[PDB]
Amino acid sequence: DGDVEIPPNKAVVLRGHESEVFICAWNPVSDLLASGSGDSTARIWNLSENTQLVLRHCVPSNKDVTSLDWNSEGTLLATGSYDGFARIWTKDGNLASTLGQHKGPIFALKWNKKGNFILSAGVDKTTIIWDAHTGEAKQQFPFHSAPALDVDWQSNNTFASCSTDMCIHVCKLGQDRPIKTFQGHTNEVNAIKWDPTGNLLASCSDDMTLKIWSMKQDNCVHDLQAHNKEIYTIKWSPTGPGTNNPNANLMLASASFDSTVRLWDVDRGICIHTMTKHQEPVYSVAFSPDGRYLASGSFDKCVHIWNTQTGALVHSYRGTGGIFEVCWNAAGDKVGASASDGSVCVLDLR
Length: 350
What we know:
The chain is mainly β. It has one domain: 7 Propeller (Methylamine Dehydrogenase, Chain H), CATH 2.130.10.10. The chain has no helices and 32 strands. Strands 1-32-31-30 form a 4-stranded antiparallel beta sheet, with no helix packed on it. Strands 2-3-4-5 form a 4-stranded antiparallel beta sheet, with no helix packed on it. A 4-stranded antiparallel beta sheet has the order 6-7-8-9, with no helix packed on it. It is classed as unknown function. The entry lists the keywords Structural Genomics Consortium, SGC. It forms a monomeric assembly. Crystal structure of TBL1XR1 WD40 repeats.
């Protein structure tokens, strides 16, 4: 029972953003940190040990950068905004291409693994696959009846989306109907994630459940009453078959409005660990590259780092703003966290 607070000399607080920083993500091939803000800017921070690029999407009103994603090679940064535009920026901070526009806010966008497509979800109830080479929409899928809140690629051509309409559609480029629709949630679906093998889809909902789905059947395979309140985020550990950690147990993390964080063994359908230190809603969790640690961020203004084998608290950092997102660098020895007061913090865990 010792102290685990990351000391001031191991925390870099980056300032520049003029309002809430909703999102951040590390470059996969170097220690560049991308952040996205309600101030209508994304920023690329250089944390290399060998300095601040500002990517202006217009403080401008209602031009929030809502979403961002690095391609696998780390050469390009895709962003989505409140004004409905998907954009592609170079790692050097130049706007390469404005892809086109959803009608109103983009809520999520993701590169496919191959890096040739970008997938976006909009408040306009649709999803769009964009050609990243030509910078043009390839296909729009108008399947939902309410805002599309999240997307996750199953392959380089197949994906899932979830919605305020409580449904999950599995879609494929070239198909004008969903391949499959998962129904069973009774409230807004906030996130879905394919497992590392692409065989299982996890979903979480305002209906306080976590559901696990399979393409083989209509009903969810698992239906976990995971928390007492709305469940905001889920992540699979990068472990098990088809990962760099093939023998490690596959885990699912979940976190809730009720401030709890939990780790699940999905196969056995049970909760491995409950982490309870947070005191406010948790909006973000993320596994370290080797799956041995879990970061969680809360509006209690703390980042907590958990040992996924024991559930023990191993690191902590109290910042000055409510945390919207936490994320790990490629080496798994730095965590970035974007906060509501305009701060982005880099935590050195060595």
